[PDB]
Amino acid sequence: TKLEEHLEGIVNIFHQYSVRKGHFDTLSKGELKQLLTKELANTIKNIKDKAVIDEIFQGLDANQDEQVDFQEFISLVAIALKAAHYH
Amino acid sequence: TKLEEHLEGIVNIFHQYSVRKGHFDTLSKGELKQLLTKELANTIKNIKDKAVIDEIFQGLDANQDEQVDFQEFISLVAIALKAAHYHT
Numbered sequence: 001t002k003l004e005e006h007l008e009g010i011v012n013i014f015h016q017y018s019v020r021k022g023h024f025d026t027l028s029k030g031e032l033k034q035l036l037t038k039e040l041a042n043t044i045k046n047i048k049d050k051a052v053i054d055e056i057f058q059g060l061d062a063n064q065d066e067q068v069d070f071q072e073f074i075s076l077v078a079i080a081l082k083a084a085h086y087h
Numbered sequence: 088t089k090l091e092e093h094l095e096g097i098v099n100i101f102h103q104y105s106v107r108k109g110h111f112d113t114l115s116k117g118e119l120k121q122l123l124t125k126e127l128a129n130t131i132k133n134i135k136d137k138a139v140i141d142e143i144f145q146g147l148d149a150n151q152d153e154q155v156d157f158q159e160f161i162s163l164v165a166i167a168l169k170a171a172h173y174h175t
């Protein structure tokens with residue numbers, strides 16, 4: 001269905017970035033920065049700012065292991081959707 | 088971006104179902120049923136069963152106002168995302 005395609009698209013984008021360095025199924029700080037700056041530039045304010053990126057990663061990394069896993073990444077999608085819906 | 092298109096797309100699909108009755112920006116039980124059965128049948132097992140539907144509803148309707156608002160609907164998106172991601 002159309003909803004299922006969107007969901008699959010989000011998962012695909014997660015991996016677009018997660019496979020690039022280190023573990024294939026988690027985002028490093030560097031991978032997350034790339035994902036945020038290139039994919040959410042029109043969604044989150046000042047995403048180009050280091051401080052902004054840094055607080056987002058910290059907020060997402062709930063077990064503070066320096067990676068953002070898929071379950072943690074769902075939190076970002078929720079932030080992004082709330083922003084998108086305000087549009 | 089492609090991600091932003093998927094996000095807008097999820098918002099649109101929420102509205103596709105939410106505009107049918109009552110408030111345009113929240114989902115009544117009947118609307119949620121429509122959304123679940125018509126958009127998530129390949130994602131949640133036994134979605135056609137009435138007890139499966141009712142429980143999803145009560146589970147998402149965290150403030151008990153008999154509507155699933157968009158913030159509440161994000162919970163459903165999280166459930167569905169986990170299913171798509173699963174490595175088999």
Ligand SMILES: [Ca+2]
Nearest residue numbers: 018021023026
């Ligand atoms: Ca990685």
Ligand SMILES: [Ca+2]
Nearest residue numbers: 061063065067
């Ligand atoms: Ca982590």
Ligand SMILES: [Ca+2]
Nearest residue numbers: 105108110113
């Ligand atoms: Ca409605």
Ligand SMILES: [Ca+2]
Nearest residue numbers: 148150152154
């Ligand atoms: Ca509610």
